[PDB]
Amino acid sequence: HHHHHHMRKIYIAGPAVFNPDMGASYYNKVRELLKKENVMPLIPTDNEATEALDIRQKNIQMIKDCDAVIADLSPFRGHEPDCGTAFEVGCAAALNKMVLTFTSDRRNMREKYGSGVDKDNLRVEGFGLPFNLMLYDGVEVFDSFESAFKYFLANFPS
C-alpha cells in the first residue's frame, strides 16, 4: 500500500526553442498532450539558467532522468535537422534511452537535395533515410510528435 509511483518523463528535444515565442506554442501543445496521460515533459527551457554550460548540464541531466526522448528532427535552416537536437539524440543513445524521432519531411536525403550531391558537390547520403544515418536507430521515423507519443504509450507502459 502507498508504494512509490514512477511518473513517466519524456525529454522534448527539438528546435522549437528557436521559434519567436521561444517554443511556447509547441511546448504548450506538448504539455496538454502529455498531461492527459500523466506523463511529464522535460522541456529544454524549464527553469532556464543564464550560463551556457549550466543550460547544457541541466539538459543532459534531463536526458539522464527521462524514460524516453521524443526528438524533432524536422528540417532546420535547410534540409538538415538541428544540431542541438542531434547532440541530445546522441546523448540518449549512449545512455541506452528509448529515442523516438519525427520530422515534417520524411523524404530521403537524395530526394530532398534532388541529387546525390549538394550545390557544392558534397555527398548526400544514399541509405533511404530522411537525415544523417547516425540519427536512425531502427525505430520508425514518425510524422509528428503525436505519432511518436503514441508509440511511447504502447511501448513504455506504467
Q: What b-and-e string marks burial along 131-146, b requiring 16 or more CB atoms within 10 Å of the CB?
A: beeebbeeeebbeebe
Among residues 73, 87, 84, the alpha carbon closest in space to that of 131 is found at: 73
Rounded CA-CA distance 150/76 in Å is 24
Grid coordinates representing 8?
A: 513517466
Grid coordinates representing 153?
A: 504509450
Nearest approach, Cβ of residue 135 and ligand CCc1ccccc1CO (Å): 8
Radius of gyration of the chain (CA): 16
Q: Which range in 100-108, 112-120, 126-134, 145-153 contacts ligand CCc1ccccc1CO by CB under 6 A?
A: 126-134
40 to 79, contacts with ligand CCc1ccccc1CO by CB under 6 A? 44-45, 55, 59
Give 78 or 157: the residue with its C-beta nearer to its own copies: 78
Residues lying near ligand CCc1ccccc1CO in the complex (CB under 6 A):
17, 44-45, 55, 59, 84, 125, 132-134
Residues that bind its own copies (CB under 8 A): 15, 17-20, 22, 52-53, 55-56, 59-60, 63, 76-95, 117-118, 120-124, 127, 129, 131-138
